[PDB]
Write a protein that binds this ligand. Structure first.
Ligand SMILES: NC(=O)C1=CN([C@@H]2O[C@H](COP(=O)(O)OP(=O)(O)OC[C@H]3O[C@@H](n4cnc5c(N)ncnc54)[C@H](OP(=O)(O)O)[C@@H]3O)[C@@H](O)[C@H]2O)C=CC1
Ligand SMILES: NC(=O)C1=CN([C@@H]2O[C@H](COP(=O)(O)OP(=O)(O)OC[C@H]3O[C@@H](n4cnc5c(N)ncnc54)[C@H](OP(=O)(O)O)[C@@H]3O)[C@@H](O)[C@H]2O)C=CC1
Ligand SMILES: NC(=O)C1=CN([C@@H]2O[C@H](COP(=O)(O)OP(=O)(O)OC[C@H]3O[C@@H](n4cnc5c(N)ncnc54)[C@H](OP(=O)(O)O)[C@@H]3O)[C@@H](O)[C@H]2O)C=CC1
Ligand SMILES: [Mn+2]
Ligand SMILES: [Mn+2]
Ligand SMILES: [Mn+2]
Lengths: 564, 564, 564, 47
């Protein structure tokens, strides 16, 4: 059992969620910590505390209510919170994170109770260092930061966006073993364009429009300097839920000098590629053999596309051959050389070709082996698309990644029905198992970002990686796919079970760490004997620490009170 | 505004519900307190904070949910909690106290989240003083203590009875202006005879049967020494929800030596007598002239009967004559001289008479002018009973005090219908107004303990009364009756409106204070010239204290830094 | 200024020597820190504070009393302490360190007032980690540890030796700008061989003889692990005043794994070599042209000679031929091949020659160009030896490094007299300037270890050097030599003035930093543009930090308290 | 003896002259109060 020898005592100790064990404090602990009397006279194991929380949890009426209970728990007893979450990760993850946290964010100003994380405003420009001083933990190793401009698929929720870093970091700990005491959730509030928040008497954020331009850019620059300067260059800074243009610009500006990544961009690319690589073990061919069409050409599309191209390069295909294997379709139709409304990013995939608008005709023309939906238009993979995909391919790869299911390009039911059970399918949001007329039940998995960010963070931090390369994400994808068993693939699953996520994370971290020592990118020395054991030692446990003073005697001769 | 300069700073300040203002902290406060950045960047007035709480309160679906919300509030921001409560005292009183606190106590072990008050067990015997040391407020002026043996009419709830002192003290503050920082809810856990709880894995108390006899009595003795020793002999100790024999025994043992009362006995007495004194203004006769019949002969009845006797003595009637004006019925029937099953206390009212069992007959024989239900038998005041009462009395006084409504001896509807609108009626649980055939609308009042205890406590503590005499409760009954206007009486109310409870408490306190300095019973000197203003100055306000340091300049010459 | 935002307030703030300004706190600072009233009502500039201290210092009767006064200052107001020291380092250095600290250590148990530093005993074996936890500063970058077995020339002073690490770390700050808050003095008490201490009722250490052997070695291993584990592998650990065999064994065992050095061995080497390199600018010839005779063969001689050999090798000489340039004399006389009583270390200088035991004849035989005294035998450089050195050499280099004065191999007076003014002289202890017969005055300097260790520590920590090589000491010696002007060399000074010592340290650290980036040994990234400005930014100023909260407004619109 | 239960621990406890016993703090007091290591390893009676 770990130590932690606190100087805190009495009432204020019970107010620190990292020290407070509530009823799991033993009589000895209570008396020694000067809190005996502040708790009822029973001693609970952690399991009994978990039963109590779960009894409450079940009598609630909704997931939002269940979220409120769990956030209350987080703010009173951090270890019990994590014990609860880890006790059934697949059940608790969608409560503290997506999709429920979506509603939590929409509702954040109304239900606002106890604050979590640090709020830094445009009006703190020049003072970010001193805002950091307000945070009561000095040793921070991981920051998740948002500006609330692009929350999930809900858009600009300004300061209400604070629900995202808080819940995301809960998953860093629960799924990846990051120390919660070492994690800092951050919102930068530069204003909001959210009309309802601007009108709303209860809104907790700055009641102003967003600050744009170089004032915004300088602010972010100060943010990066203040945080790395205070917590050291090794501190991970993860961007979440910024607007695309911002997310891309900020990632490119900083990635080469700070320990930073953007999960919406790079993590998405990673888990999508993991799924593709897993699928390859069913189609029994190479990435090189694929023709990939993206339904959508936005942040997810370009991120995934980028990473696929490197995977192709890694197979031994030159960049320009690599690129020609990938077609995009945006809201105006296929991306072709010299089409109107193209961006610099879309341009990279604008091959010479007739312009087309109709996705059915696009499918018939391109004949992809892999069709990836990241456009947020529900039902875009029509019956005709699915028949055509199953006609051109023995085992068509079909990813409906748009969330929630009401947005999915197709359902698993339609996908398997129309492709006569031949499709290799993955989704963004959970679909139930599907049983074919031959009595086999297929279990389509989700390309959940959680498979990526926890392990990456743990890896990067454990070995002191100063930079987070594209290769980190490609490597990570290979590790995930590797955890998928032949048995899983045969059941139609392209991702390891969600209930294993702790282990998947461990393996991702193991690999990054192993790699870092081998290519001398690690900064933590001396090099560990055993890389598995070392990563494990860096992982937060849900068991309570001991916090009692270390008490031990000396030989009586030298322990005696001298007199004369 | 009150100035209270805190030395607390940073995170831990926000964790103290006496310091924490939430979003009502100004920018200046936040920066000065080293918490700037721990809150979202909006600044709320107290009225805006209330609105947030009320919106959430109105989204909830049960009184229990409402109770849990307000209790979470109490533990985060005490001032805002009291601001919410006092915003609509009549609405909020039944949520934080009775009847809702009844369910809270049944569910206490299940919903246990953030502890409140001080738990002292039989096993801390000989160490009570060191248990007290855990309480983070040194200055304590009021204590409510239970052993949980008799929580409401719910029986032995042992350690689950902590809901009662906590909720009771909330009303001390809300209704009487007692400073919550100076209030200490206590449970003594000596075990429980509650069998579900002894079996309940979640039970927060000592999983054992109650300690009885002299070990119990000695423990209580230590409690009174430790408490009076630490907080001084002026600290008010109120007993609540003890079993019958204990309640009387403890009250009798200590009331002469400590500043102590029992509210189930003496407060009930005071509020019942107040309703009688008010009724007398309708029946236009003396207390002398009354014949009182109690349905029930427990804590309530015996307390009420004692104070009526004391009132009769005041008017000038000898004690043995006063006693003969009062008859009691227990579960065994009428209390008469030389009946089987008589406690020492019931003996005092056993007059020579034929034994009787049936309440209808008893009423027909005794022909009371006033009939008081304190037996918790619902519907005991049958049509025949009421008919009888209206037959022998021009204006029969009828108190149906049993709680809740289901246990009331009759409804207001029944009582008025069957007595042809003639009865003077009061109850323990609220009934809607009744409009009679003659176009009169009557508004039957509730004999709420809340009219009494907050004012008594405020008064006693304000002037430093060392003992709480019978006289205090009688004068209190008088003060309460005085706040009833003839308009009220003509409307059939025997109590002031509930929404004026703060004003009632002040008048009660004013009276106690004036009396104590008159009869030199006060211990707080020098005597204030203006007792009204002095009491008011002792009342807690729901406005935020200023906690920032006192900043002010000195003349230039003496403020300057000395160099050369 | 520099900003250090504390959460401490009220009395306890004044008790923290890093926060306390005493009378230099402004009225604003006082009111804001909740300490207004705890100080008399005058506001002093730091200079006024210094004037008060120095007046007190000048009225005292002994250097011992002055030491106690300054040590009392250190423990009340750290910044003022350092301000005082640095106002006249030549004056104050000999009070807080040698020779006064020698007497302090002899008297430590008698005068023990307020503790300084951390005490770790053999009896804490297995629990050193938890002893570290008592230290109130979490961020430690420099540790000075002794076991007290060889304090100065006063032998084994056991626990009383704690005065050495305290006084040494004062010089690290005063002379080199190490942050004292980041410094940790440590005594390891494994017992003492000092019989008078063992007998003394007041002795503050373990009343037992020294644990030897594997138990000792394992204890030291845990210490290294515990300290490097808590404070990190970049934390500088400097050994001081261990017995010889221990000092060497420990240094060799750890120098390749930990960021460690031993100042008695390696710092002595560096400063002595610096003096030699400076002398070469008078003799105007090369190091390889010298013949060096050591009076003594102890820790100092072996260490100095080792570094001379390296400097010769650098100039271009193979090792075996450089060794030939150095002759050692011990208590059994000259070291020569096959001789009785030879340690393996002496063996390295055991050349082919006949045994001799008379220093005078040894001189006459060897005809050294350089005579280095480190044998502690007062007066060993006799008039005859001084005549011989003057006869064989135009400018004989003569170092009487033995400490204090009474142990010097010769005085400045005698050296200059008998060598008729041509000796190039330096000592370990200060001698007054010497007026020669021709009325010119020479100013022999001191080979004071303070020229070396402050700058080495500053440099190593600034760039995060993980190991401290012999080259560091050689380079450092060169840098110090470079700081000596020609004019100084003509005044008989081999060392830069003590009053520039901060500047010397800065130069030394600049050089270490410049080299560490050049040769890819630095661990602090990114690489700074200006090494000079970088090092200087890391140096602790004696100017008071600002500790008030950072207060600043927001535009009126967003700072406004919101209502309805 | 009289008992005064302090919530103060570690370095700052030693800076309170009503709490601080110097070398009269026993090894157990020192370890309990999180000050073990801040004093030399001998225990003094008041005399
Ligand atoms: N791990 C997962 O499960 C993840 C799933 N996703 C899902 O992917 C979807 C897209 O996300 P993201 O890339 O961030 O969103 P963006 O807004 O960046 O991308 C939207 C893209 O869809 C395009 N589009 C809109 N209508 C059509 C249409 N009718 N036909 C073709 N393309 C169309 C837009 O076109 P234009 O460029 O012309 O506007 C744009 O290219 C979301 O539903 C998100 O939930 C995202 C990340 C992770
Ligand atoms: N201000 C208010 O609203 C207050 C209301 N009350 C109400 O009064 C009621 C009694 O409270 P309390 O006095 O504390 O309770 P106790 O339990 O102390 O007394 C109950 C009495 O009722 C008697 N009783 C039981 N059954 C019958 C029966 N069938 N016929 C006649 N008498 C019977 C019991 O008889 P025995 O002695 O034989 O057991 C006992 O004397 C409760 O319902 C309570 O809510 C109380 C205080 C204040
Ligand atoms: N910067 C400075 O000014 C420094 C000065 N010094 C000074 O140098 C002196 C030596 O210190 P250190 O080397 O640590 O001490 P040690 O005790 O390690 O070495 C002393 C040496 O003197 C030898 N010796 C003893 N008697 C004689 C003799 N009659 N003739 C010749 N040699 C003799 C001893 O011989 P054996 O091996 O036979 O015992 C031993 O070699 C001390 O006075 C110290 O103050 C030291 C470090 C730094
Ligand atoms: Mn996101
Ligand atoms: Mn009660
Ligand atoms: Mn030394």
């Amino acid at each position: 059992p770990r130590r932690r020898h606190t100087h805190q005592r009495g009432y204020l100790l019970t107010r620190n969620p990292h020290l407070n064990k509530d009823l799991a404090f033993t009589l000895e602990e209570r008396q020694q910590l000067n809190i005996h009397g502040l708790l009822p006279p029973s001693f609970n194991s952690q399991e009994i505390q978990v039963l109590r929380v779960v009894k409450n949890f079940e009598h609630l009426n909704s997931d939002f209510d269940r979220y409120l209970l769990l956030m209350d728990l987080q703010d009173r007893n951090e270890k019990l919170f994590y014990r609860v979450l880890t006790s059934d990760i697949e059940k608790f993850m969608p409560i503290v994170y997506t999709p429920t946290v979506g509603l939590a964010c929409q509702q954040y100003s109304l239900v606002f109770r106890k604050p979590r994380g640090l709020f830094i405003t445009i009006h703190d420009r020049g003072h970010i260092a001193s805002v950091l001083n307000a945070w009561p933990e000095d040793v921070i190793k991981a920051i998740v930061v948002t500006d609330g401009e692009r929350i999930l698929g809900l858009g600009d929720l300004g300061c209400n966006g604070m629900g995202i870093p808080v819940g995301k970091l809960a998953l860093y700990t629960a799924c990846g073993g990051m120390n919660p005491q070492e994690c800092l959730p951050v919102i930068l509030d530069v204003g909001t364009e959210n009309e309802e928040l601007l009108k709303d008497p209860l809104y907790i954020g700055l009641r102003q429009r967003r600050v744009r331009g170089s004032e915004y850019d300088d602010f972010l620059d100060e943010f990066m300097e203040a945080v790395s300067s205070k917590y050291g260059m090794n501190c991970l800074i993860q961007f979440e839920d910024f607007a695309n243009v911002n997310a891309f610009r900020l990632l490119n500006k900083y990635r080469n000098q700070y320990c930073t990544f953007n999960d919406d961009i790079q993590g998405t690319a990673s888990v999508a590629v993991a799924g593709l690589l897993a699928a390859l073990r069913i189609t029994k061919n190479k990435l090189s053999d694929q023709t990939i069409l993206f339904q959508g050409a936005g942040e997810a599309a370009l991120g995934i596309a980028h990473l696929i191209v490197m995977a192709l390069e890694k197979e031994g295909l030159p960049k320009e051959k690599a690129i020609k294997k990938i077609w995009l379709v945006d809201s105006k139709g296929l991306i072709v050389k010299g089409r109107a409304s193209l961006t610099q990013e879309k341009e990279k995939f604008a091959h010479e070709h007739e312009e087309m608008k109709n996705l059915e005709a696009i499918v018939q023309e391109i004949k992809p082996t892999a069709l990836i939906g990241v456009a947020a238009i529900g039902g875009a993979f029509s019956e005709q698309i699915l028949k055509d995909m199953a006609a051109f391919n023995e085992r068509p790869i079909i990813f409906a990644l748009s969330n929630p299911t009401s947005k999915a390009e197709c359902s698993a039911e339609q996908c398997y029905k129309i492709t006569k059970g031949r499709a290799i399918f993955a989704s963004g949001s959970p679909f139930d198992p599907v049983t074919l007329p031959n009595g086999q039940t297929l279990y389509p998995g989700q390309g959940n970002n959680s498979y990526v960010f926890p392990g990456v963070a743990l890896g990067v931090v454990a070995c002191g990686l100063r930079q987070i390369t594209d290769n980190i994400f490609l490597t990570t994808a290979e590790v995930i796919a590797q955890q998928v068993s032949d048995k899983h693939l045969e059941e139609g699953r392209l991702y390891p079970p969600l209930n294993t996520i702790r282990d998947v994370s461990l393996k991702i971290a193991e690999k990054i760490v192993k790699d870092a020592y081998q290519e001398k990118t690690a900064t933590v020395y001396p090099e560990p004997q055993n890389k598995e054991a070392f990563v494990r030692s860096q992982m937060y446990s849900t068991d309570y620490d001991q916090i009692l003073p270390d008490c031990y005697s000396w030989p009586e001769e030298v322990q005696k009170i001298q007199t004369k």
